[PDB]
Structure formats: C-alpha cells, structure tokens
Amino acid sequence: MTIGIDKISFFVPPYYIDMTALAEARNVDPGKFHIGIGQDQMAVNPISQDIVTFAANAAEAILTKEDKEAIDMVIVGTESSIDESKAAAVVLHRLMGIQPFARSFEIKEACYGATAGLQLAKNHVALHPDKKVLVVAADIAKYGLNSGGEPTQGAGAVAMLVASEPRILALKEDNVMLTQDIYDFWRPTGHPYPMVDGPLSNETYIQSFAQVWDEHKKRTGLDFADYDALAFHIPYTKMGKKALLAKISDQTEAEQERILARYEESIIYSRRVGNLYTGSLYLGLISLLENATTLTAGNQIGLFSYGSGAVAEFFTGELVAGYQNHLQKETHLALLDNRTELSIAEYEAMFAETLDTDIDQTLEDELKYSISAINNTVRSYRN
Amino acid sequence: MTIGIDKISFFVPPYYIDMTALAEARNVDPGKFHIGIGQDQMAVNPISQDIVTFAANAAEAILTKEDKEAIDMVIVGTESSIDESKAAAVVLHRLMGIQPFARSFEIKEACYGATAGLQLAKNHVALHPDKKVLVVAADIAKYGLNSGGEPTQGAGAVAMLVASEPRILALKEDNVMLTQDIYDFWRPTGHPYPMVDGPLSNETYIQSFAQVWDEHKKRTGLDFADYDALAFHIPYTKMGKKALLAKISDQTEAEQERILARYEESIIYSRRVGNLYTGSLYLGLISLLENATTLTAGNQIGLFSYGSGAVAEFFTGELVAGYQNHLQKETHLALLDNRTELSIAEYEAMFAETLDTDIDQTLEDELKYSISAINNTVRSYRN
C-alpha cells in the first residue's frame, strides 16, 4: 500500500502589493526585490484574517463529506499561533465539519511544523489505511515596516489530505532529518516580531541542506540525476537558489540547467506570494505540480524542508499516475489574479493595525472564515 | 511486535508549600484543599527553572548512551512554551546529547500534547522498530496568587522512552479520541495566566470521559470489570474521582470500591505535586506502577487523557513482564521527600518574580539545567 498526498491546495489573502511599488516607497531600485530577493508580489492580510481564516479556506477547497467522515486526525503547523494552550486545529476541526472522534493538535517548530505533521500523518495512515489525516500549514510572516525582512513577508496556508493509495504524491521512506540548536531565527514569548540573525540564517539554511542531502545520498546513493525535480522551503527565491547552487556545482552543465529550470518552475506561485513559513515548501510543490509541464507519472520529487533553530529534513515523493487531474491550478490562478492591489499607503494602514484581543468588538470582512467578533478574548469566525 | 513505554520518570522543582499553609493564609478551611480539591502539597518553581529545566532532568533520569543513538525523534508536549517558533525539543535534543539525525518538535494541545506525542511515537516505532522516540511532557501551571485555580497549581515534567518490545507498558490499538471546540480553558497570546471557565471546565471534563468511555465500550465490549486500573489526567484529585463516579454508578458496590481503591493509588504522587497539565496523567500512571502493590504482569490499564478546548482520548496498556525492575521508585521518593518547604511569604515572593527575557543578566541556581544566563533573550542552561 502506498501513502501520501491525495489532495493539496493553498489559500492567500485577497490583497497584495507589487515589489516595484515597495522598492520605490523604500527609495531603492525596483531591481533589489525583483532581482536580488527574487520576489514580485507580496501577500498582505488585514487583522480580521488569521491562521484559522486561511487554514479553513484552504482545506475547504479540498474536503468532501466522505473526507470529513474518514479523517480521524487534524494537524496544524504554524509558528503564528493565537493561543498558547488551545490548538487552532480544534477550531479548524469544527469549521470543517469533520467527524467528532478525532485527534486535533498544533505542531510548533518554525517553518518545519507542517512537514512534521505530514510524516506523522503518513505513519498513521500506513497503520490505519482506511483513515485519513488533514495536515494544514498556516502562517502569517511579518518582520516590520522598513525592516530588513519586509520584502520577504507573506501570509496564507496550504492544506493536505493524507491517505492511502493517494492520487497525487506517494511518499517514500528515505527520510533524512537533522536537529541543531542554532539561534538563526526565534521569537520569545511576547515578541510580535521575530528575532533574526540574518547571516546566521543564511549559512545555516544552506548548510543544513548540504548536510541533509549528503547523508541522504550516503544512505540511498541517489544523486541529482536521479531526481526529476526538487521542491524547497525558502524564505525567498534567491535563497533556495543559493542553497541549490552550492550543492550542484560539480554536476554537468546540462544537469545544472535542468535542476535550476525545475527550481524556477517551483517558485512561480511563490514569486507572487511571499514567505508562507510552514507552507513555503508546499506552495513550491503545488507550483511544481501545476506549472511544471515536463513532469509525469513516476518522476521522483525531492523535498527539502527547513525550520529555523534549526530543523531540516529531506524526503522523496513519486508522481502518481493521473495526478494531473486532481489539482486546483485554476482556483489557484483565479485566487491570485483576483486579489486587490494595495497602494503602499493602504498597505501600511493594513500592516500596522492591531487586533486587541482583550477588547470586545465586531469586525467586518467579506472573506469567509474571517474574524467576525471578539468576546472575552474569544474569536468568532464568519462561516 | 509490541510497542510502548520502556522507561519513564518525572521531575519536579525542589520546593513546595503545604496546602494547610495555603488555606490558612487564604482564610479558607484546610479541608477545602485537602478533601475538597484533594491536594496536600504543591510544587513551586523559581524563574531560573523552566520547561527545559524539567524536561532535561526527567529525561536525564532514563537515558543511556544506547538510547541517545537509537532515538530519532524528540517530542515535547507543553502549553507552557517559551518561544513561539523554536521548539523546546531542540534544546532538549542538545542537552540530552541525542544523535544528530533526529526530528525534534513541540506539540501544543493544552494538557493533551504529550499523549499526542506518545501515540505518534508508537506509530513511528511500529514502522521503524529499531528506533526509539523520546516523548516528554513539561509544564508550569500558574493561575495567580489569590486565584480560584491557585490550589491546583503545579509544575514539572514526565519523560518517556518509546520503543518496541517495551519493558513496562505495551500499548494496545483501542484508541477512542474526541475533539470538540469548547472554551473551558485557553490562554490568548500575551496572557501569562489562562482564561478559565470553571463550571464549563468541570462539565466538559466529566462529559468527555463519558463520551469517550462509552464509545470505547461500544467498539470493544470492555467494561470496568475488564480493567485492573485506570489512570486519569486531572487538574486535581477530586475531579477524576467525580468523573470516575459519574460513570461507575451502575457497577457493583464491590466493583466501585475496587476501581476507587485503584484510583486512590494513582494519585499518591499527584497529591504531593499538583497539576502538571500535560504530564498529569503520566504522573498518575507512574504512581500506579510504583504504588499499586496488587498490580501485576498482564493486567490491563486504561488511560484517560484530556486537554482543554477540548480533546480527550481513552487508550489501554498492559503491564509487561518484569516491569517492576525498570521503575524509579527511590529516585522519585527522594525527589519528593527532599524538597524545601516554603512559607507562604516565600512562595509569594517566588511566584510573582518575573524573568525579563529582554534584559541580559545572570542567574544563580543550584539545579542542574536551570537557567544560567539570558543574552539577547537566549537562555543558557547550567549543564
């Protein structure tokens, strides 16, 4: 029995700011964002939209009644939580109408959370093939106006229906994971914005990939030639390209052109969204599935998942025969095309606004699953 | 292949306050805490001791060099986190000296976290029998001085080595889990103390046990008579007794006496510690193993795990032949008996004190793994 991703979909807010507008507002050369970071459009979200808002819309795009009855585990991976005790997965479970006898919880490990949930979900289904697990990555990435990280900001969520005899991606058991206590990025309790050691984040991300890849090659003998495509967690485009470059230098010129071509295909939707933290890698994978014209059934996909602090893991997935018929390109393309472009002024009004959870209030937002009210610090959602 | 808990241990801070002292200082009848709540001594911890401090001491009590090399996953369950991104499991992985190639993350679902980690660990080992997983519950439960929940406070951690062919407890596949979005207890980001609906927390905990127990009975046909002992998560002693009572009303007078007698044996250590949230149920299981003179190999043990907001799950375990030779009774007792009793004036000074993570400073504390210093919000530990 094969196990893996049966359905996948992402969701992003109805708002975005174009990088050239940002460059100009920050008195720099449009090129620095388009050509340095490798970013074009950033996702922007108002206070009435949180991780439940995204996780709910994303999963609502792939769940059927039969899925609601088979799912016995819901997992949310995020490093943008709203409660320190109650898991957002409990509210996702209610809003999605999933049957009651299920286990729900949140997993926290920087941008690596959703990968953890997915592998644990793979194990669960492998042991109970009739059951399914909903693994959703949801995050909001803010660094601060005029911040060093500002151009790498993003927001959204990616939902995965994990089952046996999957229709899109059958996961293998070649996992190589690594844990290292490094303070490249962190956020002490109480800190709205993360603490960032930029250079350390850079080196650690590039090195973690090297170490994990080498071990995997050492344990499985598989090299770049053996992979049709590679999907990466990335805080921004140019980063995964630098990590990719550093490792493929000794491959043939043609082999390098092929791997980079495929990397470029994996970051199409990301260049229009930004960092989704836990869902970054998954957004890359969705991209590869919907935009990569030369992939086909049977091809091998390498996945490098990273989490600051730092955790990292490399694993493989195989294209399932007929996968091309169970994607959501369209809804994904409409989703992106239909967003409203905020001017820098609008964008800043939206970014700086706070949601004071202690104050009772009502919020208006047309988006389904967005926050409708707050009473005694409890959020209500507009379903 | 049986899979389960091979070794377990708990750790609590070196101090405590007598519940009679608390009642007198709070102008309340000693018996309200002693009988009402069913608590005798509360675990108190200073600022220099956090979730890492406990999780490390606990695990250090059961890890061998061989265990450090076989463990490929480290999981910490808590609702007392110190970082919103980086999982305490990463620091625990470093302090414990576990081999590098491991997956490390934190799980958040109120007091249900560690139970999630144990089950997923079970799955992992079932699939990779030569591997072991370290699952540790670590939490600090504070409600505030002169709080309604004050007498139910606690602090500590319980560590579990999950492996195949376990020496203490072999886990069955009879799990009945449940998820319900209810605000009985939660803690919005930014809130040092939880928001608590007492009556709702009460009814929800009792009703969850009922619903879960009935379902397990409907699916397996097993009733109370079939169990040699039951272990419960409990915010306090009298709670699990009230939940136990509401469900065993129609059993024989002799059956009720036996189940209660066994329940009383599960709460011996808890009456001297208080609420460990995630590790509460596990502290009860350790108590049963170390205090229950009549238990023996092959006896069945049902465990009821509850986490606020609210998830619950009922599963069973069987005592493995020779389990009596792989427990830590002396160390545990030595841990409880050798603690320093604080006067209420001392307890109040400890409790209120805060750790300003933003201020770089040093900290002196004799406990191994307590915080030694803070620099740029990064905690260093005394190893």
DSSP state string for A236-273 = SHHHHHHHHHHHHTTS-HHHHHHHHHHHHHHTTTGGGT
Dig out the tokens for B25 from the structure.
Answer: 């200082």
| Paired sense of beta strands A132-141 and A154-164, if any | antiparallel
Cα dihedral across residues B280, B281, B284, B285: positive or negative:
negative
**Which chain B residues are closer than 8 Å to A179 by Cβ?**
74, 89-90, 93, 98, 100-104
CA B11 from centroid of its chain's CA atoms: 10
For residue A353, which amino acid is it?
Answer: E
Phi-psi region of B222 (alpha: psi -120 to 50; beta: other; left: phi over 0): beta
Question: Which is nearest to B363 in space by CA: B352, B348, B351, B378?
Answer: B378
Q: Are residues A43 and A89 in the same domain?
A: yes
Determine which helix (DSSP H) or strand (DSSP E) holds A74, and give its type and residue range: strand A71-77
Q: Which of A278, A298, A320 is the last residue of a domain?
A: A320
Tell me the C-alpha to C-alpha distance, in Å, between residue A246 and each of A180, A203, A213.
20, 11, 12
Terminal-to-terminal C-alpha distance of chain B: 37
Q: Are residues A10 and A133 in the same domain?
A: yes
Contacts of B274 (CB under 8 A, 6+ apart): B39, B41, B42, B43, B141, B152, B153, B154, B155, B236
Chain B nearest-CA distance from A65, in A, is 18
Cα dihedral across residues A99, A105, A109, A111: positive or negative:
positive
Question: Which is nearest to B1 in space by CA: B101, B83, B111, B122?
Answer: B122
Provide the domain count of chain A.
2
CA A2 from centroid of its chain's CA atoms: 24
Mark yes or no for CB contact B178/A101 under 8 Å: yes
Terminal-to-terminal C-alpha distance of chain A: 37
Dig out the tokens for B346 from the structure.
Answer: 């001392």
- DSSP H helices in chain B: 19-25, 30-31, 51-60, 65-70, 88-95, 113-127, 198-220, 237-247, 253-266, 280-291, 329-337, 344-352
Q: Are residues A166 and A190 in the same domain?
A: no
Dig out the tokens for B187 from the structure.
Answer: 């803690």
Determine which helix (DSSP H) or strand (DSSP E) holds B76, and give its type and residue range: strand B71-77
**Residue in A with minimal Cα distance to B107:** A107
Q: Judge whether B192 and B343 are in contact, CB under 8 Å.
A: no
Closest CB to B109: pick one of A106, A110, A123: A106
Dihedral in degrees, nearest 10, Cα atoms A268, A274, A277, A280:
0
Q: Judge whether A38 and A236 are in contact, CB under 8 Å.
A: yes
Question: Which is nearest to B103 in space by CA: B128, B126, B74?
Answer: B74
Q: Are residues B203 and B297 in the same domain?
A: yes
Chain A nearest-CA distance from B310, in A, is 7
Q: Are residues A331 and A248 in the same domain?
A: no
Q: Are residues B338 and B296 in the same domain?
A: no
How many helices, marked H, and strands, marked E, lie in chain B?
Answer: 12, 18
What is the Cα–Cα distance from A289 to A295, expressed in whole angstroms?
8
User: 3-state DSSP call for residue B173?
Assistant: coil
- Strand arrangement of the beta sheet that strand B361-362 belongs to: B361-362, B371-375, B378-381
Q: Judge whether A267 and A235 are in contact, CB under 8 Å.
A: no
DSSP state string for A147-188 = -SSGGG-EEEEEEEEEEES-SSEEE-S--EEEE----SEE-B
Tell me the C-alpha to C-alpha distance, in Å, between residue B22 and each of B13, B63, B151, B347, B348.
18, 37, 8, 10, 10
Q: Are residues A292 and A158 in the same domain?
A: no
Q: Are residues A20 and A106 in the same domain?
A: yes
Residue A237 C-beta-side C-alpha neighbours within 13 Å: 26
What is the Cα–Cα distance from B351 to B353, expressed in whole angstroms?
6
- 3-state class percentages of chain B: helix first, strand second, coil last, to nearest 5: 40, 25, 35
Question: Which is nearest to A179 in space by CA: B105, B302, B25?
Answer: B105
Question: Which is nearest to B316 in space by CA: B291, B285, B286?
Answer: B285
B32 annotated as ligand-binding: no
User: 3-state DSSP call for residue B133?
Assistant: strand
Tokens 């049709």 belong to residue: A228
Question: Which is nearest to A109 in space by CA: A231, A284, A278?
Answer: A278
Q: Which domain holds residue A51?
A: 1-172+321-383
Q: Judge whether B318 and B285 are in contact, CB under 8 Å.
A: no
User: 3-state DSSP call for residue B43?
Assistant: strand
Catalytic residue among A79, A109, A313, A318: A79
B233 annotated as ligand-binding: yes
Mark yes or no for CB contact A104/B109 under 8 Å: yes
Chain A nearest-CA distance from B30, in A, is 31
CA B220 from centroid of its chain's CA atoms: 27
For residue A297, which amino acid is it?
Answer: A
b/e for B10-46, b at 16 or more Cβ within 10 A? bbbbbbbbbbebbbebbeeeeeebbebbbbbbbbbbb
Q: Which of A266, A288, A320 is the last residue of a domain?
A: A320
Question: Which is nearest to B165 in space by CA: B221, B127, B126, B199?
Answer: B126
User: 3-state DSSP call for residue B207?
Assistant: helix
CB pairs A-B closer than 8 Å: 214
Task: List the single best residue of B74, B98, B108 to mutate versus A (max A Cβ within 10 A).
Answer: B108
Return the axis-axis angle of helices A329-337 and A280-291, rounded to nearest 10°: 110
For residue B336, which amino acid is it?
Answer: L
Closest CB to A101: pick one of B94, B109, B177: B177
Phi-psi region of B355 (alpha: psi -120 to 50; beta: other; left: phi over 0): beta
Q: What angle do CA B154, B156, B159 make, to 5 degrees?
A: 145
Tokens 């093939």 belong to residue: A129
Residue B47 C-beta-side C-alpha neighbours within 13 Å: 18
For residue B159, which amino acid is it?
Answer: A
What is the Cα–Cα distance from B336 to B8, expressed in whole angstroms?
16
B303 DSSP β-pair partners: B231, B315
Phi, psi of B173 (to 5 degrees): -115, 70
Q: Are residues B77 and B143 in the same domain?
A: yes
Q: Judge whether B205 and B243 are in contact, CB under 8 Å.
A: yes
Return the axis-axis angle of helices B280-291 and B253-266, rounded to nearest 10°: 110
DSSP state string for B283-294 = HHHHHHHHH-TT
Burial class (CB in 10 A: 0-12, 13-18, 19+), A1: exposed
What is the Cα–Cα distance from A278 to A105, expressed in whole angstroms?
15
Q: Judge whether A40 and A271 are in contact, CB under 8 Å.
A: yes
What is the Cα–Cα distance from A370 to A98, expressed in whole angstroms?
19
Q: Are residues B340 and B257 in the same domain?
A: no
Dihedral in degrees, nearest 10, Cα atoms A21, A23, A25, A29:
-120
**Which chain B residues are closer than 8 Å to A376 by Cβ?**
195
B291 annotated as ligand-binding: no
Cis peptide before B310 (omega within 30 of 0): yes
B109 DSSP β-pair partners: B111
What is the Cα–Cα distance from B149 to B201, expressed in whole angstroms?
12
Question: Which is nearest to B282 in space by CA: B164, B158, B182, B166?
Answer: B158
Question: Which is nearest to B121 in space by CA: B103, B101, B97?
Answer: B103
User: 3-state DSSP call for residue B381?
Assistant: strand
Q: Which pairs count as long-range contacts for B117-120, CB under 8 Å and 24+ apart, including other chains?
A: B117/B75, B117/B76, B117/B77, B118/B5, B118/B160, B118/B162, B119/A103, B119/B175, B119/B313, B119/B315, B120/A120, B120/A123, B120/A124, B120/B75
What is the Cα–Cα distance from A380 to A363, expressed in whole angstroms?
10
Question: Which is nearest to B106 in space by CA: A106, A306, A175?
Answer: A106
Dig out the tokens for A93 from the structure.
Answer: 């479970």
Tokens 């409907």 belong to residue: B218
What is the Cα–Cα distance from B373 to B362, expressed in whole angstroms?
4
What is the Cα–Cα distance from B54 to A17, expressed in whole angstroms?
46
**Which chain A residues are closer than 8 Å to B113 by Cβ?**
105
Question: Which is nearest to A77 in space by CA: A333, A276, A324?
Answer: A276
User: 3-state DSSP call for residue A325?
Assistant: helix
How many beta carbons lie within 10 A of that of residue A297, not counting itself?
Answer: 11
Task: List the single best residue of A50, A108, A133 to mutate versus B (max B Cβ within 10 A).
Answer: A108
Tell me the C-alpha to C-alpha distance, in Å, between residue A74 and each of A150, A161, A296, B255, B337.
32, 10, 30, 37, 42
Question: Which is nearest to B40 in space by CA: B9, B16, B24?
Answer: B16
What is the Cα–Cα distance from A350 to A336, expressed in whole angstroms?
19
Contacts of B92 (CB under 8 A, 6+ apart): B52, B55, B56, B59, B74, B76, B104, B134, B136
Q: Judge whether A154 and A274 are in contact, CB under 8 Å.
A: yes
Chain A nearest-CA distance from B171, in A, is 14
For residue B269, which amino acid is it?
Answer: Y
- DSSP H helices in chain A: 19-25, 31, 51-60, 65-70, 88-95, 113-127, 198-220, 237-248, 253-266, 280-291, 329-337, 344-352
For residue A120, which amino acid is it?
Answer: L
Closest CB to B190: pick one of A173, A180, A190: A190
Mark yes or no for CB contact B83/A186 under 8 Å: yes
**Residue in A with minimal Cα distance to B115:** A103
Mark yes or no for CB contact B191/A81 under 8 Å: no
Q: Judge whether B157 and B139 are in contact, CB under 8 Å.
A: yes
Contacts of A225 (CB under 8 A, 6+ apart): A251, A255
Dig out the tokens for B6 from the structure.
Answer: 């091979």
Cα dihedral across residues B263, B268, B269, B275: positive or negative:
positive
Q: Which of A265, A286, A320 is the last residue of a domain?
A: A320
User: 3-state DSSP call for residue B255?
Assistant: helix
From the CA atom positions of chain B, what is the Rg in Å? 20
What is the Cα–Cα distance from B18 to B34, expressed in whole angstroms?
10
DSSP label of B278: G
Dig out the tokens for B364 from the structure.
Answer: 């002196």
What is the Cα–Cα distance from A180 to A173, expressed in whole angstroms?
22
| Paired sense of beta strands A132-141 and A169-171, if any | unpaired
Q: Are residues A141 and A97 in the same domain?
A: yes
Catalytic residue among A93, A124, A216, A233: A233
CATH number at residue B41: 3.40.47.10
What is the Cα–Cα distance from A89 to A157, expressed in whole angstroms?
13
Dig out the tokens for A157 from the structure.
Answer: 């969520």
How many beta carbons lie within 10 A of that of residue B61, not counting itself?
Answer: 17
Stated resolution in angstroms: 2.4
b/e for B131-163, b at 16 or more Cβ within 10 A? bbbbbbbbbbbbbeeeeebbbbbbbbbbbbbbb
How many beta carbons lie within 10 A of that of residue B247, not counting itself?
Answer: 16
Q: Judge whether B117 and B106 are in contact, CB under 8 Å.
A: no
Dig out the tokens for B291 from the structure.
Answer: 């205090």
User: 3-state DSSP call for residue B326?
Assistant: coil
Dig out the tokens for A179 from the structure.
Answer: 């844990």
Tell me the C-alpha to C-alpha distance, in Å, between residue A359 and each of A50, A376, B332.
17, 8, 46
Determine which helix (DSSP H) or strand (DSSP E) holds A135, and give its type and residue range: strand A132-141
Tell me the C-alpha to C-alpha distance, in Å, between residue A320 and each of A67, A124, A287, B244.
20, 20, 16, 49
What is the Cα–Cα distance from A190 to B187, expressed in whole angstroms?
13
Q: Are residues B51 and B156 in the same domain?
A: yes
A206 DSSP β-pair partners: none
Tell me the C-alpha to C-alpha distance, in Å, between residue A38 and each of A42, A204, A271, A284, B170.
11, 20, 7, 14, 52
Dig out the tokens for B350 from the structure.
Answer: 């400890």
